[PDB]
Amino acid sequence: HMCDAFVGTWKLVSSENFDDYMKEVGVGFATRKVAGMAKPNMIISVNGDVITIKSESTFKNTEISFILGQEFDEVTADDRKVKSTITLDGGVLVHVQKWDGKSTTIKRKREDDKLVVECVMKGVTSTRVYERA
C-alpha cells in the first residue's frame, strides 16, 4: 500500500519556472521549447515492490520502473543518461538523478486532489501541478 495515493493517471494542468529549471539542467533551446509545450499524462502504478511511472507526452514518452532505494539507469526525455534513485521520505517520492558530476531532484507529493511535482536544480525550482485525468 506503498504509494496508494499516487497510483492513477494524472494530467498536467499548470507549470511555473520550468524553462528556467531546464536551462539550469543544461537542456538546449529547441528541446526546451518543445518540452515546455507538452501537457503530459503521468501514469503511476505499483505491482508488488515495483513502481512504474510513465510520462505520455507529445514531446517524448518515458517509462521508468524501480524499487525504492535501489539505483537504476534512466535515459531522460532530454537524452541525459543518468543514474537515478527514488525513495519515499515522509510520504513524498524523491527522485535524484546523477550525471556528469551534477544532480537534480524531482519530488512528487499528493496535496489535496493534486499531484505536485517540484523539480530542483541548484537554486532553481519549478512547480508542476497535475490533476486526475
Q: Which residues define the annotated binding site for a fatty acid? A: 128-130
- Residue sitting closest to ligand TK6 (CB): 77
Residue 84 touching ligand TK6 (CB under 6 A): no
Answer positive or negative: Cα dihedral of 97, 33, 61, 80: negative
Residue 35 touching ligand TK6 (CB under 6 A): yes
Distances (CA, A) of 122 to 22, 46, 79, 102, 103: 11, 31, 20, 9, 8
Residue with cell 535515459: 75
Interface with ligand TK6 (CB under 6 A), residue from 9, 17, 45, 76: 76
Rg (CA), the chain: 14
Please name which of 83, 47, 41 lies closest in space to residue 62, comparing C-alpha atoms.
Answer: 41
Interface with ligand TK6 (CB under 6 A), residue from 6, 55, 74, 93: 55
CB of 77 or CB of 88, closer to ligand TK6? 77
Residues within the interface to ligand TK6 (CB under 6 A):
12, 22, 27, 35, 55, 76-78, 106, 117, 119, 128
